[PDB]
Design a protein around this ligand. Structure first.
Ligand SMILES: NC(=O)c1ccc[n+]([C@@H]2O[C@H](COP(=O)([O-])OP(=O)(O)OC[C@H]3O[C@@H](n4cnc5c(N)ncnc54)[C@H](O)[C@@H]3O)[C@@H](O)[C@H]2O)c1
Ligand SMILES: NC(=O)c1ccc[n+]([C@@H]2O[C@H](COP(=O)([O-])OP(=O)(O)OC[C@H]3O[C@@H](n4cnc5c(N)ncnc54)[C@H](O)[C@@H]3O)[C@@H](O)[C@H]2O)c1
Ligand SMILES: [Zn+2]
Ligand SMILES: [Zn+2]
Ligand SMILES: [Zn+2]
Ligand SMILES: [Zn+2]
Lengths: 374, 374
C-alpha cells in the first residue's frame, strides 16, 4: 500500500521555458495535515498550461503544470474531513478557503489563498511535494495535474459524484465552468439578447453554450481559424465571422450586424487588442463586455475611457465567477442529469505519455480539448 | 408680446477657446414645430462648461454654453403637447426621444438623439436659433442656458412642479442628479459598504449624498484641495484623505484603510491617472468603479487588464443613469417632499452678468456650485 510513503511515478516536468515537457520519474511525498494525495485519471490540456510554456503566464520553473483534471483520492493527511480515500475528486485551481473576505462575500469567488496573482509554486505551507533528479520541483496553482499522482490542499479539492465519468467531467475543473459561468453568472446574459464571442476554443465554445442556455436570440462567434466554425454552430452560434475576410475593423462589422452594438461580448483569447475590440462592439449605452482570456504578463492595454462614460460595463472573472468548492459538485450533478453536454468539446483523447503531441495539436489549431489518460 | 417674434436679449457667447465669456446681445428665433422657447431664471456653473473653455470637451465654437438650468416656458411651437406657456421647466442635455433602442431599453439612458458623442451644436433639425453680430452661434447639447432666452426641442425639456424654487432645483438639471444617480442607480451602492469618492466638487458631493442615502457605512472623500473636506463631511463623508500628505501611492493608502480595497469607488474629476487609481483601490474580486468625470478629448489611458480579470467591474455613465424626461419631474417632486437637500452645494449666487467671476471661483477652488440668476 502507499499510504504514508513516497510514491515514485511519472510526471511531465517543464525544466525551462519554451521547451518540450520531459516525461520522467518524480517522487511524490505523502500528504501533511489537511492535504490530499490524488491518483490522476484524466487531465485536459487548457491554453493556460501552454501560457506557462511560452512565458505568457509566469510561475516558478521547474514546475509540473496541469490544472484541469479529475482523479481518485489515494490518501488524506490528518484533519481532512471533506474527502476520503476512494472518492472521485476534481482539484480546484481557484481555492475556496471559506474564511477570507472574498469567500464570505456573496458574489466574489477569487479566494485570497489563490496562487495565481503572486505565484509561489508551493503548497499552502510554502513547501513542495515533488522531487525529480534530487532537485525540488514547483507546484502550479496548488494542482499540478500532469503527474500520475499529485498532492493538493483540502481547500483546493471538491468531492464529486461517484458515478461521474472522469474522462469527461475533468473539463468542469476549468474550461467548461469558466465559459458557462462567464455567460450565465458573470455577464448574466438575458433572454432575447445578441452576444458576440471572440475565440472559439474550449472555453469560447463553453461561453456559447452558456449564452444559448440563458436564451440569447443571436450568438456571433468570432475566430481567425475558420475550421472552428462548424463546431461553434453545433453548440449554439447563429453565425460566425472571420476578421480576415473583411476590409474594415471587426468592431465596425459587428456594430453594423447588430444594428449599433451587441448586448454582451466576451473576449476568450487573451490578447490586448481583442479585449479593446470586444468592449467597443457592445452597445455604448448599455452593453456589457467580459474579459475571460489571460493577458501576457505585465503588459498594458491602451483605451479611450469615453467607451465607458456612455454607459458600457467592462468586467473580467476567474473560473466563470463560481465559488469553486460550492459549485463544482453541483455542476457535475447537472452534467449527470443531462443539463449540458461536454462531448462536443473533446476532439482527441491521448495517453499521458503523448502530452507533447497534445500540445502541438492545440498550437496547430487542430484540437479543441485533448484529454490525456493515465 | 414676444410669442412668434424674434427676441433680442443678452447671452454669454464663447468666441474662442481659453478666452472669457463675452456678454452680448443675441437674437433668438421663435420655436419651430416641437420646440419650446424658455425664459431662463437660474443656471449653475458646472465643470463641463469650463471643459468647453479649456478645449477638454470639444464642441463647435462660437457657442452659448450652459446646460444646468431652470426657467419658464415663454412660447411653444406647433405640435408641442408636453408643456404650455407659463410652465416651470428644466432643459435636458441628455434627451429622451422615447423611440430609439436606448430609450426603449429599461436600463440605458444615453438617448441616441444626444449631441454629446459627436457634437454638431445645432437643434435636432441641423439649424441654430441664435444669431449674434449677424453670425450664427452654436447651441451646446441642445440646451445653451447662459442666455436670457433659449429654444430647445421638446424631447430635451421636462415640466416640473409649479411651486418649485427654480434657483435651487436647476441643480437637478445636471450636478445633483448625476452624482446621486451614479451612486444609487449606476453603481448601486449597498448598505454597509465602504465607498471612496475621488473629487469633492458639486457632483462629487452629490455622489456622497447618494452613497449615504443608499446606506454606505464608510465614505472616504479624496481631494487634493483640503478646503473641500468640511463640506464633504457635512454631506456624509466619514473621512477625507489628501494625496499630497502621503509618501506612498493613494491606491496603497486606500487599500490599507479598507482592509484590502473599497467596495465602490467613483472618479468624479476627469483625469486618466485617477480613473486607473480609482479602479485599483476597489477590492479585486468584487469591487465596482464608476467613472463620472469627463476625460480630456482623444486621450487614451493605459491599464493592466489583470485588474479586471480578478473580478472587478468598471462602468461609466452620463447624467447618473437616469432617463432624463421621466426622472427629472420625479426628483423635483422628491425635493419638494424634503427627501434630499440641495442647499449644501450652492456656495455663491451671482447675477448672470458676473458669469466670468463665477468661472474664476470654480477654477480657483473657492466655490462648489455658483448659481447665476437672471
Ligand atoms: N479566466 C479564466 O479563469 C480562464 C480559464 C480558462 C482559460 N482561460 C484563458 O482563456 C483563453 C482561451 O482558452 P482556450 O483553452 O479556450 O484556448 P484555445 O487556444 O483553445 O482557443 C483560443 C482561440 O482563439 C482563437 N484566436 C487566436 N487569435 C485570435 C484572433 N486574433 N482573433 C480571433 N480569434 C483568435 C484561436 O484560433 C482559438 O480558436 C486563454 O487565454 C486561456 O488562458 C481563462
Ligand atoms: N458623467 C456626467 O454626466 C457628468 C455630469 C456632470 C459633470 N461631469 C464631470 O464631472 C467632473 C466633476 O464635475 P464638478 O462640476 O463636480 O467639478 P469640480 O471642478 O467642482 O470638482 C473637481 C474636484 O476634483 C478635485 N481634483 C482635481 N484634481 C484632483 C486630483 N489630482 N486628485 C484628487 N482630486 C482632484 C478638485 O479639487 C475639485 O474639488 C468634471 O469632469 C465634469 O466635467 C460628468
Ligand atoms: Zn484552464
Ligand atoms: Zn477564501
Ligand atoms: Zn454638468
Ligand atoms: Zn431616445
Amino acid at each position: 500500500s502507499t499510504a504514508g510513503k513516497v510514491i515514485k511515478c511519472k510526471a511531465a516536468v517543464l525544466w525551462e521555458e519554451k521547451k518540450p515537457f520531459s516525461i520522467e520519474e518524480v517522487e511524490v511525498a505523502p500528504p501533511k495535515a489537511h492535504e490530499v494525495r490524488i491518483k490522476m485519471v484524466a487531465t485536459g490540456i487548457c491554453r493556460s498550461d501552454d501560457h506557462v510554456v511560452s512565458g505568457t503566464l509566469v510561475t516558478p520553473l521547474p514546475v509540473i503544470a496541469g490544472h484541469e483534471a479529475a482523479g481518485i483520492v489515494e490518501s488524506i493527511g490528518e484533519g481532512v474531513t471533506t474527502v476520503r480515500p476512494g472518492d472521485k475528486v476534481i482539484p480546484l485551481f481557484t481555492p475556496q478557503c471559506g474564511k477570507c473576505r472574498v469567500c464570505k462575500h456573496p458574489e466574489g469567488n477569487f479566494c485570497l489563498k489563490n496562487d495565481l496573482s503572486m505565484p509561489r509554486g508551493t503548497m499552502q505551507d510554502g513547501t513542495s511535494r515533488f522531487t525529480c533528479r534530487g532537485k525540488p520541483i514547483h507546484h502550479f496553482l496548488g494542482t499540478s495535474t500532469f503527474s500520475q499522482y499529485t498532492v493538493v490542499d483540502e481547500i483546493s479539492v471538491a468531492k464529486i459524484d461517484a458515478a461521474s465519468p472522469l474522462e469527461k467531467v475533468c473539463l468542469i475543473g476549468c474550461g467548461f465552468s469558466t465559459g458557462y459561468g462567464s455567460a450565465v453568472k458573470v455577464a448574466k446574459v438575458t433572454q432575447g439578447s445578441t452576444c458576440a464571442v471572440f475565440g472559439l476554443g474550449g472555453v469560447g465554445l463553453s461561453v456559447i453554450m452558456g449564452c444559448k442556455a440563458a436564451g440569447a436570440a443571436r450568438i456571433i462567434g468570432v475566430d481567425i481559424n475558420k475550421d472552428k466554425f462548424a463546431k461553434a454552430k453545433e453548440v449554439g452560434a447563429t453565425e460566425c465571422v472571420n476578421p480576415q475576410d473583411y476590409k474594415k475593423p471587426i468592431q465596425e462589422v459587428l456594430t453594423e450586424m447588430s444594428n449599433g452594438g451587441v448586448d454582451f461580448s466576451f473576449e476568450v483569447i487573451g490578447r490586448l487588442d481583442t479585449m479593446v475590440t470586444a468592449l467597443s462592439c457592445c452597445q455604448e449605452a448599455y452593453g456589457v463586455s467580459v474579459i475571460v482570456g489571460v493577458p501576457p504578463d505585465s503588459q498594458n492595454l491602451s483605451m479611450n475611457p469615453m467607451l465607458l462614460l456612455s454607459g458600457r460595463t467592462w468586467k473580467g472573472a476567474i473560473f466563470g465567477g463560481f465559488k469553486s468548492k460550492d459549485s463544482v459538485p453541483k455542476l457535475v450533478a447537472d452534467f449527470m442529469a443531462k443539463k449540458f453536454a461536454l462531448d462536443p468539446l473533446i476532439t482527441h483523447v491521448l495517453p499521458f505519455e503523448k502530452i507533447n503531441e497534445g500540445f502541438d495539436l492545440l498550437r496547430s489549431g487542430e484540437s479543441i480539448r485533448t484529454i490525456l489518460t493515465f
